[PDB]
Write a protein that binds this ligand. Structure first.
Ligand SMILES: Cc1cc2nc3c(=O)[nH]c(=O)nc-3n(C[C@H](O)[C@H](O)[C@H](O)COP(=O)(O)OP(=O)(O)OC[C@H]3O[C@@H](n4cnc5c(N)ncnc54)[C@H](O)[C@@H]3O)c2cc1C
Ligand SMILES: Cc1cc2nc3c(=O)[nH]c(=O)nc-3n(C[C@H](O)[C@H](O)[C@H](O)COP(=O)(O)OP(=O)(O)OC[C@H]3O[C@@H](n4cnc5c(N)ncnc54)[C@H](O)[C@@H]3O)c2cc1C
Ligand code: SF4
Ligand code: SF4
Ligand code: SF4
Ligand code: SF4
Ligand code: SF4
Ligand code: SF4
Ligand code: SF4
Ligand code: SF4
Ligand code: SF4
Ligand code: SF4
Ligand code: SF4
Ligand code: SF4
Ligand code: FES
Ligand SMILES: [Fe+3]
Lengths: 291, 149, 184, 138, 652, 187, 187
């Protein structure tokens, strides 16, 4: 499998350990990740989609064009970037008026989207094209710990275009984390939002933290040792938000946060130093002792 | 045209009478046996495929026989000789475009015993020369008598 | 007391035009199918800790209450798509909120942090750009010091600046190219 | 300066009703098409479509009941086998496959008819005039 | 004879005239060959317009009339009668749709719409010239009716027809008649027992001298046409001798195998040998061979020696003139609405399950109890519109009865347990008929039933107690509610019955977008179907209550009695026929007709095809498929259609 | 004589109202109000139409669909709130509708060029004479009384006397046509 | 003998069970008391005149007379106003199909007017009904139009001169008709 690896913003420029973790994990599964040179912000639909829809799609198509020129499909480890580029691609295929508008703008930079790009979220790529069986075959260090699985919202929703099954009762991530020897603990309002999306983290911080706190409390009550997400935005909200909850409300949890690639990396015997858990706001050391 | 037909027509005109051509299609004259239940085509074969039964109608055997869309009078020498009718006498008086009617008939009966589930793409995928299969002798008299270039 | 003079009758149509052709005329015109059932509000995680009521946004849009564009409430939606997934009338709720926010942005109702985010993508092609600590972290992790992204590609940065100017996004956020900063 | 000439063939039980419903609902669509009424799409055969191109049709449209909903049980299943061969025969004759359009539209589906007419008109307008009659009139 | 045509252009007030330049179309019409008269008028279907045609037919000796106006689907019969009254054969009349198909869809392109109108008139005139005079076919009507479905609707049809003196056959799928009404405890708005109205009717129908009831039977084949249907009924094997059976049920006490009771919606347990419900008609027992172990214990207690395991199903052949379809409906399955947790949470039930729970003769003995612990619920929530008015499940229609049965069962629960708190989560309360709004007023003022305007978002179960929480917005307060309940009732909508697919294929009827059977015309022929001699009655035609279903049953009996009373009906002659001088018996047409009308035959020593006129419905498929052109459908001949195609581009 | 640019339909006028003695639903008003709003929009798309209602009763085949259509296709607006009063501007002739938008908990005071009252159904004036001649009874809604609402919807307690249509109770055309056919069977 | 203990007891004494039970006992005793002296009576078999009477010429009445006439029964249709059609004739279009009301009703009005088994009495009223099921004797008053029915062309030239303007009932009091008039064009 050959895929243009879209990086986004937060993973390559903040939680870089997620990038390193993905590169090796995907190489171990037999996926050739080729550099999508010059790729920009997806752009984040929370700000751009909310500010100007035409700007969101045009810039997203510009990124889609990079992979199209490369003659390959895209893979991403961020729900935000997945949602942004996937919804953009679907719209350019289903809506000709939108495609015509965008290509009239892309002509000014010498580009033209032709609809051959498929956008994939690495978790569903692992689930539908590689297989969960392959994850277990590569497990060097079984992670026998409880995980509070956070699917995020832009992963399976909107279902009408994603077609990744149920958004109410999914198994996809649970089966992928359980393949590392872990246990996906069932918790209250599991499919609820972390609170960071749609520009809420930036404009309405306390409101975002209230939702994140509810999710952490529910996971801790379910007996989770940590939380696993598939979204650098969810990652930042759960990680950096725990400091904010402490600084504002006064509630402390020290609940380890991991991105699925980091969890799969540990499982595949990677050095925790290479996963960059040190740059996390909440120490992952308590979880590292449990594994 | 058969020599007897030419004489019949010329003779009628010399007598002052108006000439009248046969009206029916070829199966009337063809000596091949037809199924009472009606025609049903399971597969389509090119003339060299398989070994045809000498008694059964070649169209029910899967060969594109134009006798159904061709005027009688010749005596059906081709099916009687072991090959399908190529439609050389042209259509009847009630058919303007012979090829079009032949395609209609052929598509109608193809997989009629499994009418609702038969794949409608088997027939176009099987016939690799449609114009040559249905307009050998009548393309110029067809509704679309040329190929656009 | 809401009088006809306090209402903007064309607000629904105005939301639809802002959504044509992206996300689409059929998508945003779906707000006209709303029968005020409340399923969207009941499904809203944000609505459980605030005064935000998803159904009222759509109501205000249909009634013509312009203040919805000046509201902080439309900015409390996280785009979780739950309402979008459960609406029995096929209203594309999440997309309508985003399109309403477009009209809000045009009125000047944009948070400074959001404009900053937009400015970072305009100036460095990225919402969260690389800093000195990024280079040092990436180096120690075994990754290329600078990711193969628009931030370090002038060709790509210039391409984006051309599209941004053509889309008028720079004027929308109030960015001055000469000064290299936002206004107000 | 040029407007497509499109001929239509609609079954009396569904598409003809679908087309009427578009009118009842004032669902505007381009005025290129002219519909011919038949009782069933099963009445439609290659010669009717080929005759239309001969006469100078830029596009040919056919509408029948949804597969399984034919007022006459299976008339449309025969037409479906006929139209698939016809698409390929037209390509062999140099007529773009796109100049022929067949759809399944029920009587209540006025919006679908309106949109099918809109989409078909745009398709033919983009292809330009079918130059068969001009080629034959030489 | 040379065509003499009269072209009439209607303005339809301004519906046509406002977009199409009608006077200009009329002028253009006169330039076509054979047009002797051409006139434009404000309303052609009005008395002046009809008299104008009738007068012109006589004064200008016309033999073809063309009306350029609305759709033949609306006024074809009107103009057919109009011309026939003047002596012109109705099949020498041709309609040109310039309103629905032109003026109403090209309002902003008047010039092009006028040009299009001219072509449509020319296309009509082109076909008109080659039209031929046709005569309707007269067929006799077998004095017998067939009612399929033994619910309140079908029973009503069978009773009225039998009371009129018509031999009627009533086929019922399950072992007893009564339908879903039999499953209800009380019925709104009178709060009568379902049995109050239904049982006497079941009794009457079973012993009616003009009605032959075939319970536990199904129609497996229907052939023919109006007045001449040949039907096959499969009398399924009960494995008990009905004439010998007493219906005492000593056998039910002895049977050791337990089967879930379908009548109780899986909330009851029946035996292999059973009677659907205590008031079942016929009051006879049935053996489910799918679960019977053949121990023969039931046979030891049966006095009359009725049990016979060697019973074989009997195929009955019957001839009927008319058929009434009254197969009813099925309750929507709410498992799909995953947020409400039906099939996951024990205490979430459907309203139909509740009916069986609240019915005295039900599995719980008329006691509303939680299926998790058997305890009576102190707090109940009804969720309205479950499986209705919802695009996500594909049901964008109102199921009509859910608002009313929810309020009725809430009244019933309060009478049995006044301390019970009941909340109804709704969008609109549809109490639209006589005494309904009054019933709604009563539920709140007399019984204290509470109403919450808010379609719930989700139901959440407490795994430890089994209690449910309903998440919904009180839209009338702009606040989110999260009330706890002991039992949640889902007011499930109506969907077509499972067998509807099989019945549709047997009768040759259509379905509306809601998947229920399609009526000829909503407003004027509410119980007739486009298929002559086939009518509808009850919920299979669309969601409705008992008052309406009984009215439809009576309506269907009237409509179905018209052909029976006349004893003769006419059929359209737009049928296929073979020109024997051209047919060489190729056999292509035979298998194309789903009614088997075209058949091969020997004539004057040779093989030729021959259509059996009565079996032809007039589709035009086999003539279209005929390679010799010998087969033609009158009124849609290839030559007629060819000229119509030429008409769009030029005059013929 | 001017064409109205703004129109308000007031639902349940003379129905579901104890003050006028009509505590029943007239059945057809929700539907005809939405229908006529569509016809006005077809003739004048620029016309703004607001329907003041309590419950939208689109209960039969294609009715809910018709209701969905009025809003999505024609842009007809609906306000849930039974108006309190209408006030005329003596200077212009324009009317003001006072009502609470119950779905917002706020009072509206919108101006209109024409106000349409969706009047309910009542028995015809001659009903009194016809009752005395046939010897039939009336239900609380003043319409004629059927033998039994479900056991006999078109029969009357008086043998050989049947009912058909709106004289038996508020209903639409198909329901009336169905009753006409039902009465013919029973009779 | 019937003893009514539901509508007359259990349904009206729900909160007084002991007294309802006592009342039911007395009603049973009252019934038993009359039952003892009841006598066997022979139901009177009476013939049925093969003719039906439909009062009201709207879509409901028209449907009843058409079905009955189509069944072969002599039917009489009495209509109060000068024309049949009812309120449906006053409508413009009909929901949920938005069909033209009169455009679909007129064919039925025509069918009824020329039906061989239906005798239409327009501008007439039933003034007396005597008898019982199967044997009703009915008196119909064929109101005077004061215009020769047979010599009436229906052109409408005598109305111009009339100096008396009457509000047109058909137009609900908006329109103005003359003493000499016609209800509607498709009448
Ligand atoms: C929970 C609930 C509560 C309700 N409460 C009320 C109420 O209080 N008042 C009210 O008026 N209405 C109520 N209704 C509506 C009411 O149930 C229907 O109006 C009524 O059952 C209509 O009867 P039907 O004859 O039309 O169809 P059905 O009752 O469904 O009867 C159909 C009959 O046909 C038979 N059948 C099916 N398929 C075949 C076949 N292939 N061959 C032969 N026979 C077949 C069936 O076995 C059945 O006997 C309620 C509905 C529900 C779901
Ligand atoms: C504003 C409005 C809009 C509506 N829109 C629709 C719609 O869009 N679609 C729809 O389906 N329904 C609609 N309805 C309902 C519809 O009008 C009725 O269903 C229909 O009129 C009922 O027909 P009917 O024959 O039962 O009564 P009517 O139509 O009123 O007919 C009764 C007839 O009997 C005559 N009559 C009265 N008294 C006597 C007497 N003493 N002797 C002899 N004859 C008598 C009358 O003159 C009249 O001709 C609407 C109703 C209203 C008020
Ligand atoms: S072989 Fe050809 S000519 Fe002979 S019967 Fe068959 S189709 Fe007809
Ligand atoms: S190909 Fe010609 S000669 Fe041969 S059977 Fe056919 S028509 Fe006759
Ligand atoms: S869920 Fe849909 S119909 Fe309901 S209030 Fe929200 S947008 Fe409107
Ligand atoms: S998408 Fe927005 S409005 Fe909808 S439920 Fe989520 S946060 Fe609420
Ligand atoms: S004939 Fe048709 S188009 Fe003309 S007035 Fe009548 S309904 Fe309207
Ligand atoms: S024991 Fe025999 S007679 Fe009694 S109910 Fe059972 S089968 Fe019938
Ligand atoms: S033989 Fe069959 S019916 Fe009789 S008791 Fe056994 S299982 Fe039950
Ligand atoms: S009758 Fe009531 S509960 Fe049922 S679908 Fe209609 S509005 Fe909903
Ligand atoms: S398809 Fe035509 S030629 Fe062939 S048997 Fe039938 S009628 Fe005769
Ligand atoms: S035209 Fe249609 S219905 Fe008639 S005989 Fe042929 S296939 Fe059968
Ligand atoms: S049908 Fe509608 S407007 Fe009419 S009384 Fe009922 S709720 Fe009111
Ligand atoms: S002038 Fe008046 S009264 Fe005389 S025929 Fe004409 S309409 Fe009748
Ligand atoms: S009737 Fe429409 S396809 Fe046969
Ligand atoms: Fe008309």
């Amino acid at each position: 499998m050959k895929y243009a690896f879209f990086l986004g913003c937060i993973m390559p420029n903040r939680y870089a350990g997620v990038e390193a973790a993905t590169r090796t994990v995907m190489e171990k599964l037999g996926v050739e990740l080729v550099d999508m040179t010059g790729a920009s912000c997806c752009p984040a639909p929370g700000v751009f989609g909310s500010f100007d829809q035409k700007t969101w799609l045009t810039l997203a198509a510009r990124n889609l064009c990079i992979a199209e020129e490369m003659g390959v499909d895209i893979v991403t480890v961020c729900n935000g970037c997945y949602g942004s580029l996937f919804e953009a691609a679907h719209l350019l295929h289903d809506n000709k008026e939108a495609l015509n508008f965008v290509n009239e703008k892309l002509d000014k930079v010498g580009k033209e989207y032709k609809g051959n790009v498929k956008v994939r979220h690495f978790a569903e790529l692992i689930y539908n094209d590689i297989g969960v069986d392959k994850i277990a075959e590569k497990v060097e260090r079984p992670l026998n710990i409880n995980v509070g699985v956070h699917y995020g919202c832009h992963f399976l929703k909107p279902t009408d275009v994603k077609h990744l099954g149920s958004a109410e009762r999914p198994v996809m991530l649970d089966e992928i984390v359980e393949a590392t020897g872990a246990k996906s603990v069932p918790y209250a309002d599991k499919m609820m939002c972390c609170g960071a999306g749609g520009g809420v983290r930036a404009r309405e911080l306390e409101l975002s933290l209230d939702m994140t706190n509810e999710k952490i409390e529910n996971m801790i009550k379910a007996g989770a040792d940590c939380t696993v997400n598939v979204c650098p935005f969810c990652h930042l909200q759960f990680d950096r938000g725990q400091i904010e909850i402490k600084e504002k409300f006064g509630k402390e949890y020290n609940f380890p946060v991991l991105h699925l690639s980091q969890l799969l990396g540990l499982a595949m015997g990677m050095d925790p130093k290479d996963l960059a858990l040190s740059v996390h706001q909440i120490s992952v050391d308590p979880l590292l002792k449990k594994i | 045209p058969n020599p007897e037909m030419i004489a019949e027509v010329v003779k009628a005109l010399l007598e002052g009478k108006e000439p009248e051509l046969p009206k029916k299609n070829l199966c009337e004259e063809c000596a091949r046996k037809k199924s009472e239940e009606g025609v049903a085509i399971e597969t389509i074969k090119r003339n060299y495929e398989g070994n045809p039964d000498p008694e059964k109608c070649l169209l029910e055997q899967g060969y594109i026989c134009l006798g159904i869309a061709t005027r009688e009078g010749c005596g059906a020498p081709c099916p009687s000789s072991g090959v399908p009718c190529s439609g050389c006498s042209g259509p009847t008086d009630a058919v303007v475009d012979q090829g079009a009617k032949m395609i209609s008939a052929l598509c109608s009966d193809f997989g009629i015993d499994n009418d609702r589930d038969v794949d409608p793409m088997i027939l176009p995928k099987s016939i690799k020369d449609k114009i040559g299969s249905f307009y050998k002798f009548t393309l110029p008299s067809a509704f679309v008598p040329i190929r656009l270039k | 007391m809401i009088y006809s003079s306090d209402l903007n009758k064309n607000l629904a149509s105005q939301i639809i035009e802002a959504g044509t052709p992206i996300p689409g005329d059929d998508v945003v015109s779906s707000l006209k199918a709303c029968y005020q059932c409340g399923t969207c509000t009941g499904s809203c995680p944000s609505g459980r800790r605030t005064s935000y009521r998803t159904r009222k946004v759509i109501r205000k849009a249909l009634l013509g209450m312009d203040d919805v564009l000046d509201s902080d409430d439309i900015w409390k939606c996280t785009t979780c798509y739950t309402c979008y997934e459960r609406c029995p009338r096929d209203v594309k709720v999440t997309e309508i909120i985003k399109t309403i926010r477009n009209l809000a942005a045009q009125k000047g109702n944009m948070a400074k942090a959001h404009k900053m985010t937009a400015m970072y993508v305009l100036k460095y092609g990225h919402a969260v750009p690389a800093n000195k600590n990024t280079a040092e972290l990436r180096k120690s992790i075994g990754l290329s010091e600078k990711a193969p992204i628009a931030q370090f590609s002038e060709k790509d940065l210039n391409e984006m600046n051309t599209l941004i100017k053509e889309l008028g996004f720079d004027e929308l956020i109030g960015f001055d190219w000469e000064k290299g900063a936002l206004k107000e | 300066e040029w407007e497509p000439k499109i001929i239509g063939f609609c079954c009396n039980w569904c598409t003809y009703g679908g087309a009427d419903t578009a009118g009842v609902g004032r669902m505007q669509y381009p005025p290129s098409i002219r519909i011919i009424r038949v009782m069933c799409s099963g009445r439609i055969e290659p010669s009717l479509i080929l005759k239309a191109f001969k006469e100078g049709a830029d596009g040919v449209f056919v509408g029948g009941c949804h597969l399984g909903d034919c007022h006459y049980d299976s008339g449309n299943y025969k037409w479906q086998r006929r139209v698939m061969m016809l698409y390929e025969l037209l390509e062999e004759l140099g007529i773009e496959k796109e100049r022929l359009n067949h759809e399944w539209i029920s009587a209540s589906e006025g919006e679908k008819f309106q949109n099918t007419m809109k989409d078909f008109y745009n398709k033919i307008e983009a292809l330009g005039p079918c130059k068969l009659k001009e080629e034959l009139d030489k | 004879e040379e065509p003499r045509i009269g072209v009439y252009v209607c303005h339809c007030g301004v519906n046509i005239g406002g977009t199409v330049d009608c006077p200009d179309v009329t002028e253009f019409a006169k330039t076509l060959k054979n047009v002797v008269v051409a006139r434009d008028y404000k309303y052609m279907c009005a008395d002046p317009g009809q008299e104008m045609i009738k007068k012109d037919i006589k004064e200008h000796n016309l033999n073809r009339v063309v009306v350029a106006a609305c759709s033949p689907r609306l006024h074809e019969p009107t103009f057919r009668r109009c011309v026939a009254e003047a002596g012109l054969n109705p099949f020498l009349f041709e309609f040109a749709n310039i309103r629905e198909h032109c003026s109403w869809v090209h309002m902003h392109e008047k010039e092009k719409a006028t040009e299009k109108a001219k072509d449509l008139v020319r296309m009509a005139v082109a076909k008109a010239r080659l039209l031929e005079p046709l005569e309707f076919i007269k067929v006799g009507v077998t004095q017998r009716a067939l009612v399929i479905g033994g619910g309140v609707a079908g029973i009503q049809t069978a009773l009225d027809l039998g009371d009129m003196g018509f031999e009627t056959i009533l086929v019922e799928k399950t072992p007893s008649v009564g339908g879903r009404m039999a499953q209800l405890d009380k019925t709104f708005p009178t709060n009568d027992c379902s049995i109050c109205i239904l049982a006497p009717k079941m009794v009457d129908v079973a012993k009616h001298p003009n009605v032959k009831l075939y319970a536990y039977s199904e129609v497996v084949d229907v052939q023919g046409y109006v007045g001449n249907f040949k039907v096959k009924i499969m009398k399924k094997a009960r494995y008990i001798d009905e004439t010998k059976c007493t219906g005492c049920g000593q056998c039910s006490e002895v049977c050791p195998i337990d089967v879930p009771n379908e009548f109780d919606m899986g909330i009851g347990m029946r035996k292999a040998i059973y009677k659907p419900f205590p008031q079942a008609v016929p009051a006879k027992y049935t053996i489910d061979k799918e679960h019977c172990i053949e121990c023969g214990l039931c046979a030891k207690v049966c006095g009359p020696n009725a049990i016979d395991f060697d019973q074989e199903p009997e195929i009955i052949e019957a001839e009927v003139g008319t058929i009434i379809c009254a197969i009813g409906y099925d309750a929507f399955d709410p498992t799909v609405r995953e947020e409400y947790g039906y099939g996951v949470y024990d205490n979430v039930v459907t309203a139909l399950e509740l009916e069986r729970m609240i019915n005295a003769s039900g599995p719980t003995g008329g006691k509303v109890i939680r299926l998790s612990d058997g305890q009576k619920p102190k707090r109940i929530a009804f969720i309205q519109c479950v499986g209705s008015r919802d695009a996500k499940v594909g049901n964008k229609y109102c199921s009509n009865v859910c608002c009313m049965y929810a309020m009725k069962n809430s009244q019933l629960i309060k009478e049995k347990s006044p301390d019970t708190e009941i909340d109804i989560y709704y969008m609109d309360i549809r109490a639209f008929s006589k005494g309904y709004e009054e019933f709604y007023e009563r539920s709140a003022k007399q019984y204290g039933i509470k109403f919450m305007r808010g379609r719930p978002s989700q139901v959440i179960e407490d795994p430890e107690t089994g209690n449910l929480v309903v998440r919904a917005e009180d839209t009338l307060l702009g606040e989110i509610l999260e009330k706890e309940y002991d039992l949640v009732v889902l007011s499930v909508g109506m969907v077509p019955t499972k067998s509807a697919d099989e019945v549709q294929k047997i009768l040759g009827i259509s379905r509306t977008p809601d998947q229920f059977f399609m009526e000829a015309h909503p407003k004027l022929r509410p119980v007739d179907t486009a298929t002559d001699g086939v009518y509808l009655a009850g919920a299979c035609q669309g969601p409705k209550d008992i008052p309406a279903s009984v009215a439809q049953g009576s309506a269907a009996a009237s409509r179905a009695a018209i052909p029976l009373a006349k004893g003769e009906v006419e059929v359209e002659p737009i049928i296929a026929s073979v020109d024997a001088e051209i047919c060489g018996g190729c056999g292509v047409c035979v298998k194309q007709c789903p009614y088997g009308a075209p058949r091969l035959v020997e004539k004057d020593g040779k093989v030729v095809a021959e259509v059996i006129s009565a079996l032809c419905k007039g589709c035009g498929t086999c003539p279209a498929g005929c390679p010799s052109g010998a087969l033609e459908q009158d009124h849609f001949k290839t030559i007629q259609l060819f000229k119509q195609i030429e008409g769009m581009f030029r005059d013929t």
